Ligand binder design. Structure first.
Ligand code: CLA
Ligand code: CLA
Ligand code: CLA
Ligand code: CLA
Ligand code: CLA
Ligand code: CLA
Ligand code: CLA
Ligand code: CLA
Ligand code: CLA
Ligand SMILES: CC1=C(C/C=C(\C)CCC[C@H](C)CCC[C@H](C)CCCC(C)C)C(=O)c2ccccc2C1=O
Ligand code: SF4
Ligand code: SF4
Lengths: 300, 734, 141, 39, 81, 57, 31
């Protein structure tokens, strides 16, 4: 990531020769290229009783039908490097959190009663400073946040590549006129480009994609942000505040003789954490599926 | 015992948190070990001195720098177009097009643009040349130094004021409210009629010629005869040009009112007469109380009046007031809170009396400057008030005695706080529910293709007050729209020009409104309502709660009270402060964007977009969010650069620290310590690096410090991006 | 009804929209009809009508009677809820039935909310609606 | 440039770099001082 | 380390003394109620801040409290390193 | 259970009551007492210009 | 117009009056 932001700064600093793509400082994933190659010429010798390669993204001819691509070989240049490496990065940290909760489940260097006490409990008092969030399923909380990040950027990458240099239209010459125009070799190297050259395309119609017969489905993307902020509200706040507000409303209701017999009590902090993370995930995934659903409708 | 000396306790702990806590108390004096009152009073005296000294240094800084490498005179020649100069630019890491996109105004070095706007105000005061402000810097510098020395002197034993000398109020009262600004506004008025008005009329009056030439040819005649209309001689003509004499005038104190047809600002003679008015008014207000001499009003005993005209009283307005007037002299948090609240209120008012009453020349045409100033001052204002409420809260724990106020008005407030907070929650819930319901009404109805099935309100109370001030646009013929009513022969004695101005609503003078303004104004109401809600809740819980009454002795401090019932986190009397800060930030964002959209539509007159897409929120996030950013977003890109790359960097930097804030806020201190254990385990057992050891044994952060740093990151992230956006947009769209 | 607002009858853009006014529902007269129903109000440059709220008989009924209807129904529901709650407590099965609704008793209470306003007025004059500041023992502080 | 001398060329680094350096060095050695004296 | 605070509501069930894993309590002879021996803190210096003790106090407005101080050390912070 | 100093010397904190019953003895130690309710609590403005705690009335 | 060595002058007025005056006003409060 610091390498990435380094190149970001260089581009913003009129020092373009310090970029990292083919037109600048070099790095090339030779291993993937060589494995794909040794996959290209497989039949005949490794596969005698076999006619065509297993796929056509490794090698072979660009297979298609109509003015519509079916499969062409995929190109791995420079931008592949850091993308795969940050994939590995996030997977590593995810394993870190989960395995950490795994090993340090029964006994920590400070808490020798964990398994002696349970695995679903909020904290162990303000001893040793703080100890809140020392169970295991909070470890998996953090882990699920991280895997959200992982899979989100993974689907970003997949969609953008397979709409940038794999899919589009075709001419009688087999001329593949892709949808976007090969934008990775151009902008998928700096951060500001990543917001520009992805979500400009991913939303420029959803603003106006409503307003006729086969458009009226005003999508709940406008709607999901609300649930997202309402989500994050639950995270940052404690509970005693809500308990006291509840007690005041109870005072009023009791003054007007409408006191509910079953005495309301505020949520438990683990309950609140759970509902917060649930609403967070829901809003985010709703947002993103709305995004690319409408985006495909704009081409399909 | 060396660090920290001001607390013998905190220097007895081998954990890095010492340092963290070492620099979060050095400005909390009355918590240091062993210092009674007069020590604190005298050193506060000295430290306040130092504060105003560094203020003077700051002023000298900006003024000397603009005197050095600026284009103030090149701004004199072509005012309405030439752009000011901030200072020089020097960084080896810099780009390429930077020097290529900076050198303007005839300059050859990398000039930096200026936006605060000292040129207009200064020329309004009547400056002409670099040497003027050169000498200005040179002398207020020595002023600052002398003031510093003055601060030093009273530290010596024979120059130590008395605690009684601090408690005695009425002398400070009179000396300030009469002799601090009354006489000072008099002196400013003298500088106006002696220097400012001449320079406005084109005549140069230096530091020597002022001794022999006159303000007015009729001068000194009404001095002691009483025909003051003589000084109200021929006013300036309908074609006068500042700094020139084309159609000049020879009137000193006028009451023209409205605007000047060239600078579209306040008239300078109106300013002088104004200042004179308030000066003499404060002077007559000066002798209003009782001094050490034997006449006047004894404050601490005026309201000690419980009898008049037989029917004695319960106090003034018939309410108890006995026993609290010592508190304002006992506590300091009380006075501090009052001052903070007052200051914030009048700052907001200032921020409001700028975009309609241009005080200086060229103010209205230059959009970016006034816009930045407006949002700047309002932002300054918002949490300025939060300071007042927070210090009110901390006063409630430290500075408060029970029996001394038994049964007075304060206790009668505390006895019924309940209904207050309940009804406040009520009105907040009501307004929120209904405004959101009307919004979503609009959203779904327009989401079907038929907009006529959707509600449009129309405000008329502001319309009535608008016409009733004297607006004719709506033709209601009431109160200066009725030119024949009883009050239709009153107001200003120069109301014709004011009427020409206000009828000419072409400028920013009480523009028409519609349904949207109804909506957003109710939104403001809601915002401040919940803000004051959480603040007063924290304040009135500064003592204790129903399910935790003890906290009065726990202090304005951490208390967490571990999981008694489901948990009791965030109960510590300024937990409320964080929440209030969020609730203030979003409010001020709402209001400043409303102002921005209003004036943006006013710029090119195309008000259609605002009124057309103010109802449903899709229109809000579609018409103004991204429809102004491509003018900024491509400041740098794989193809070229501009003079905005630094501003895109502003954007992204702010976003980064913003998310960092989330990181600090969510994760808590029960996980960031297990791995520090194993990470200490490393150094102990690797070779070739186990040589070095620990200055101090490192541990994880603290809880309150974690909250504080998270909030700081969030607020700094919020500040930057919005500023960059607003100034870039204003300077890129005009 | 001022503020520079043209009547929705003679606002040209109003009828301009009315011409191709998208007939919403399954009946061809849907759109046009509603535009015909929108001649009583007064439009503006936006071509869409604003609502005036003054008791002024130009638009009085267009806001008053809906308000009063809401007051009716809100009074009914609040009244029947409070009455049900008061009733439950005279059973000594309080929180057992707090989740199990006693339908044969919950019905007539709902059905008997016909004259809530004036009856409530009576409980006001009789003072049958509030308990005493100190009798209510819910401790503050 | 203008009528001033080289000064804006090189007077930033020492204020930018070396003065912070001595500042923090002196500060650190201050926060470890013995008892009961300290400068 | 931190400070401990005792009251009169100690019924004498002695669930706190069996809960504190830090040996900071003992039932010194009393006379008032049927307890005859009321809890107290003789060995504060090993206080930990876990406050599992009052969670074991059944008395209405639990009889023990802990005023969580500011003079922490390697003992009060509880480090094995 | 034995605590040990850096010098190699040992402390005998516990067991001090045999099986750690923590409530049985014929007379016990006596250092420090506070047998008082909370309704009358220490106050900021009344207890001042010194550094004592919430106990001395 | 603009200035000359007189700016070295205005630099020279500093570092004795404001400089050590502020230095003393700082060191008064016992580091
Ligand atoms: C790990 C490497 C590898 C793998 C996965 C395969 C896989 C395969 N080889 Mg193969 N092969 C390899 C190395 C490999 N070969 C090498 C190094 C040689 C040289 C000795 C051969 C020589 C060889 C022959 C001569 C034939 C295969 C055939 C086959 C296919 C057998 C049918 C099946 O389903 O299995 C299969 C695709 C047979 C086939 O019909 O392929 C379709 C066949 O006739 N291979
Ligand atoms: C270390 C960086 C630095 C410092 C100390 C200053 C210092 C100053 N700038 Mg400045 N400025 C800087 C970088 C800096 N500038 C850069 C990079 C830009 C381009 C965005 C500007 C743009 C700028 C404007 C537009 C204005 C100033 C102004 C000022 C003065 C008032 C204080 C202020 O607004 O600070 C700003 C500090 C930061 C933004 C950081 C002060 C002399 C004001 C002025 O006229 O005084 C001469 C003013 O109106 N600055
Ligand atoms: C004490 C200082 C001071 C001075 C020197 C002046 C001077 C002046 N005032 Mg004045 N004024 C002052 C304080 C002062 N004002 C205060 C404190 C108030 C109360 C707010 C007013 C309210 C006031 C009004 C309402 C008017 C003046 C007017 C005038 C001008 C003509 C006065 C004349 O000859 O009689 C002229 C007498 C009549 C026209 C009657 C003259 C420039 C008059 C003006 O602008 O010129 C006509 C005018 O109408 N003044
Ligand atoms: C000129 C205005 C002014 C002055 C003189 C003070 C002075 C003070 N404030 Mg303060 N404050 C102000 C404005 C001001 N503040 C504003 C505008 C806000 C709102 C953003 C606050 C919010 C605030 C809080 C929340 C706290 C103080 C505290 C303090 C005291 C300790 C100083 C410190 O660094 O502790 C700062 C300590 C922390 C941030 C922790 C000190 C008396 C603290 C105090 O009373 O000591 C406990 C404290 O807790 N202030
Ligand atoms: C989209 C975000 C969002 C929304 C819709 C709300 C909505 C609400 N908050 Mg809330 N809050 C949020 C984010 C949000 N919050 C965040 C991020 C924080 C900081 C962690 C808070 C902190 C906060 C506090 C401290 C309080 C509220 C309160 C309220 C209620 C105000 C009454 C009302 O009519 O509102 C509209 C109601 C609905 C839409 C339903 C309402 C339920 C106040 C309240 O009423 O409590 C009783 C209150 O005391 N909230
Ligand atoms: C809140 C409403 C309001 C406000 C702000 C003002 C404001 C003003 N009136 Mg006024 N006035 C009002 C209601 C109001 N009037 C009504 C209802 C009447 C009818 C009785 C008058 C009758 C009236 C007279 C007769 C005069 C003023 C004058 C004035 C001006 C001098 C200050 C003053 O008397 O007050 C000032 C601009 C005076 C003025 O400016 O005359 C030159 C003056 O002579 N007023
Ligand atoms: C601005 C967003 C942001 C950034 C920059 C970071 C940065 C970091 N987090 Mg992080 N975090 C964030 C938001 C962020 N977080 C949020 C919102 C959450 C809650 C969902 C977390 C939850 C979290 C956990 C649970 C963990 C981290 C870890 C890390 C560190 C990984 C080491 C690294 O590559 O250094 C980055 C260096 C530069 C960018 C320079 C790093 C300091 C992990 C860690 O300690 O790794 C060593 C770790 O355990 N963070
Ligand atoms: C909580 C943050 C924090 C802070 C403010 C400090 C502060 C300090 N550490 Mg330190 N340290 C920390 C966490 C922290 N440590 C952690 C978590 C570890 C475990 C890996 C260490 C391990 C450590 C060692 C092994 C040493 C220090 C040393 C130092 C001192 C000089 C080095 C320095 O400032 O960094 C400079 C860092 C860079 C330039 C990078 C300084 C007082 C040194 C010391 O004892 O004083 C000289 C030293 O040798 N630290
Ligand atoms: C017959 C049943 C009944 C009655 C008479 C009331 C009556 C009242 N409730 Mg209420 N309430 C009820 C059922 C009832 N509630 C139930 C079942 C819930 C759970 C959803 C609530 C939740 C609730 C909240 C959260 C609040 C009230 C509030 C109020 C008061 C303001 C007016 C109002 O109705 O707002 C009712 C508002 C909503 C139902 C939303 C009023 C005393 C408000 C108040 O300020 O109390 C003084 C307030 O903040 N109530
Ligand atoms: C990250 C994190 C930590 C860990 C934070 C730590 C350990 C502090 C970070 C170490 C320092 C601040 C890093 C900075 C070091 C600098 C590079 C050194 C400065 C020297 C230069 C000036 C030369 C907590 O302790 C914590 C506690 C409670 C809630 C949330 C959190 C939390 O989110
Ligand atoms: S504090 Fe609780 S456990 Fe201890 S003696 Fe009293 S009642 Fe028993
Ligand atoms: S935290 Fe509670 S249980 Fe632990 S030593 Fe302190 S008082 Fe005893």
């Amino acid at each position: 990531f610091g390498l990435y932001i380094h190149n970001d700064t260089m581009q913003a600093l009129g020092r373009p020769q310090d970029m990292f793509s083919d037109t600048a400082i070099q790095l090339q994933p030779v291993f993937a290229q060589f494995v794909q190659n040794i996959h290209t010429l497989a039949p005949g010798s490794t596969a005698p009783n076999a006619l065509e390669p297993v796929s056509y993204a490794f090698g072979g001819g660009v297979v298609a039908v109509g003015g519509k691509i079916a499969m062409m070989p995929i190109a791995l240049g420079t931008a592949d490097f850091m993308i795969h490496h940050i994939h590995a990065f996030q997977i590593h940290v995810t394993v870190l959190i989960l395995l950490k909760g795994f090993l340090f489940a029964r006994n920590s260097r400070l808490i020798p009663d964990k398994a002696n006490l349970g695995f679903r409990f909020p904290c162990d008092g303000p001893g040793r400073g703080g100890t809140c969030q020392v169970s295991g399923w909070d470890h998996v909380f953090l882990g699920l946040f991280w895997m959200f990040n992982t899979i989100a950027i993974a689907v970003y990458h997949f969609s953008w590549k397979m709409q940038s240099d794999v899919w589009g239209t075709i001419d009688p010459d087999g001329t593949i006129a892709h949808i976007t125009g090969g934008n990775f070799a151009m902008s998928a190297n700096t951060i500001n480009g990543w917001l520009r050259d992805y979500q400009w395309a991913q939303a420029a119609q959803v603003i106006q994609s409503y307003g006729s017969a086969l458009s009226a489905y005003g999508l709940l993307f406008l709607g999901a942000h609300f649930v997202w902020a309402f989500s994050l509200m639950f995270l940052f706040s404690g509970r005693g505040y809500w308990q006291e507000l509840i007690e005041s409303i109870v005072w009023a209701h009791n003054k007007l003789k409408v006191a509910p017999t079953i005495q309301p009590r505020a949520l438990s902090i683990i309950q609140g954490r759970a509902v917060g993370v649930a609403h967070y995930l829901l809003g985010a995934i709703v947002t993103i599926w709305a995004f690319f659903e409408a985006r495909i409708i704009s081409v399909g | 015992t060396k660090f920290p000396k001001f607390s013998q306790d905190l220097a007895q702990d081998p954990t890095t948190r010492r340092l963290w806590y070492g620099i979060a108390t050095a400005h909390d004096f009355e918590t240091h070990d062993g210092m009674t009152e007069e020590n604190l009073y005298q050193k506060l005296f000295a430290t306040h001195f130092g504060h105003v000294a560094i203020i003077f240094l700051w002023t000298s800084s900006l003024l000397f720098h603009v005197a050095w490498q600026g284009n103030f005179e090149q701004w004199i020649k072509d005012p309405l177009n030439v752009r000011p100069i901030a200072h020089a630019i020097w960084d080896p890491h810099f780009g390429k097009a930077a020097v290529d996109a900076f050198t303007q105004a005839g300059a050859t070095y990398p000039v930096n643009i200026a936006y605060s706007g000292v040129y207009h105000w200064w020329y309004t005061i009547g400056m002409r040349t670099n040497n003027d402000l050169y000498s200005g810097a040179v002398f207020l510098l020595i002023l600052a130094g002398v003031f510093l020395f003055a601060g030093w002197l009273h530290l010596q034993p024979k120059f130590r004021p008395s605690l009684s000398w601090f408690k005695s109020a009425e002398p400070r009262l009179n000396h300030h409210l009469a002799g601090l600004f009354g006489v000072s506004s008099l002196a400013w008025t003298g500088h106006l009629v002696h220097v400012a008005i001449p320079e406005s009329r084109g005549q140069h009056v230096g530091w020597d010629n002022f001794l022999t030439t006159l303000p007015h040819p009729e001068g000194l005649r009404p001095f002691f005869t009483g025909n003051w209309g003589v000084y109200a001689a021929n006013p300036d003509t309908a074609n006068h040009v500042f700094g020139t004499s084309q159609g000049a005038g020879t009137a000193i104190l006028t009451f023209l009112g409205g605007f000047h047809p060239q600078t579209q600002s306040l008239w300078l003679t109106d300013m002088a007469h104004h200042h004179l008015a308030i000066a003499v008014l404060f002077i007559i207000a000066g002798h209003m109380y009782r001094t050490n001499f034997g006449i006047g009003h004894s404050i601490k005993e005026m309201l000690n009046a419980k009898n008049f005209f037989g029917t004695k009283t319960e106090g003034q307005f018939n309410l108890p007031h006995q026993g609290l007037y010592d508190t304002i002299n006992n506590s300091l948090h009380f006075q501090l809170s009052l001052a903070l609240a007052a200051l914030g209120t009048i700052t907001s008012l200032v921020a409001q009396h700028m975009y309609a009453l241009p005080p200086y020349a060229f103010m209205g045409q230059d959009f970016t400057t006034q816009a930045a100033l407006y949002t700047h001052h309002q932002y300054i204002a918002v949490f300025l008030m939060v300071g007042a409420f927070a210090h009110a809260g901390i006063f409630w724990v430290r500075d408060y005695d029970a029996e001394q106020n038994k049964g007075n008005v304060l206790d009668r407030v505390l006895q019924h706080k309940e209904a207050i907070i309940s009804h406040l929650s009520w009105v907040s819930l009501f307004l929120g529910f209904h405004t959101l319901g009307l919004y979503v009404h609009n959203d779904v109805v327009v989401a079907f293709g038929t907009p006529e099935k959707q509600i449009l309100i129309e405000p008329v109370f502001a319309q009535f007050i608008q016409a009733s001030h004297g607006k004719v646009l709506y033709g209601l013929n009431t109160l200066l729209s009725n030119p024949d009513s009883v009050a239709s022969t009153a107001g200003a004695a120069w109301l014709p020009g004011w009427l020409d101005a206000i009828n000419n609503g072409t400028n920013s003078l009480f523009l028409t409104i519609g349904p949207g303004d109804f909506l957003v104004h109710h939104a403001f109401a809601l915002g401040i309502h919940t803000t004051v809600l959480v603040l007063v809740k924290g304040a009135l819980d500064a003592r204790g709660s129903k399910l935790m009454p003890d906290k009065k002795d726990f202090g304005y401090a951490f208390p967490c009270d571990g999981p008694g019932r489901g948990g009791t986190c965030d109960i510590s009397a300024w937990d409320a402060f964080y929440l209030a800060l969020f609730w203030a930030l979003n409010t001020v964002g709402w209001v400043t964007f409303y102002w921005h959209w209003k004036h943006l539509g006013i710029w090119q007159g195309n008000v259609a977009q605002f009124n057309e897409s103010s109802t449903y929120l899709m229109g809000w996030l579609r018409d103004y969010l991204w429809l102004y950013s491509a003018q900024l977003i491509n400041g740098y890109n794989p193809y070229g650069m501009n003079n905005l790359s630094v501003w895109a960097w502003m954007f992204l930097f702010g976003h980064l620290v913003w998310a960092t804030g989330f990181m600090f806020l969510i994760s808590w201190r029960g996980y960031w310590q297990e791995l520090i254990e194993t990470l200490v385990w490393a150094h102990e057992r690797t070779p070739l690096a186990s040589l070095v050891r620990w200055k101090d044994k490192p541990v994880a952060m603290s809880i309150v410090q974690g909250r504080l740093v998270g909030l700081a990151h969030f607020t700094v992230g919020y500040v930057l991006t919005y500023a960059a956006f607003v100034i870039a947009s204003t300077a890129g769209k005009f | 009804v001022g503020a520079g607002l043209v009547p929705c009858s003679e606002s040209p853009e109003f009828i301009q929209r009315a011409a191709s006014a998208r007939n919403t529902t399954a009946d061809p007269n849907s759109g046009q009809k509603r535009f015909e129903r929108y001649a009583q109000e007064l439009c503006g440059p936006e071509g869409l009508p604003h609502l005036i709220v003054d008791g002024r008989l130009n638009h009085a009924g267009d806001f008053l009677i809906p308000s009063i209807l809401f007051l009716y129904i809100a009074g009914w529901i609040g009244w029947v809820g409070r009455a049900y709650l008061q009733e439950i407590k005279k059973r000594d099965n309080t929180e057992l039935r707090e989740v199990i609704i006693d339908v044969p008793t919950a019905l007539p209470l709902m059905l008997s909310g016909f004259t809530w306003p004036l009856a409530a007025v009576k409980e006001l004059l009789s003072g049958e609606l509030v308990a005493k500041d100190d009798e209510i023992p819910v401790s503050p502080r | 440039m203008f009528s001033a001398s080289f000064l804006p060329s090189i007077l930033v680094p020492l204020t930018g770099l070396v003065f912070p350096a001595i500042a923090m060095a002196l500060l650190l050695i201050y926060v470890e001082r013995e008892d009961p004296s300290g400068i | 380390s931190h400070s401990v605070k005792i009251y009169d509501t100690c019924i004498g069930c002695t669930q706190c003394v069996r809960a504190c894993p830090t040996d900071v309590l003992e039932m010194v002879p009393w006379d008032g109620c049927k307890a005859g021996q009321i809890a107290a803190s003789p060995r504060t210096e090993d206080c930990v801040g876990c406050k599992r003790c009052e969670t074991a106090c059944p008395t209405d407005f639990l009889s023990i409290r802990v005023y969580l101080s500011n003079a922490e050390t390697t003992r009060s912070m509880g480090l094995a390193y | 259970i034995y605590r040990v100093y850096p010098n190699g010397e040992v402390q005998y904190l516990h067991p001090s009551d045999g099986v750690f019953p923590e409530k049985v003895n014929e007379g016990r130690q006596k250092v420090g007492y506070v047998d008082r309710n909370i309704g009358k609590n220490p106050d900021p403005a009344k207890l001042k210009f010194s550094g004592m705690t919430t106990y001395n009335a | 117009m603009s200035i000359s060595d007189t700016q070295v002058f205005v630099a020279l007025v500093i570092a004795l009056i404001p400089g050590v005056l502020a230095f003393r006003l700082a060191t008064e409060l016992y580091k």
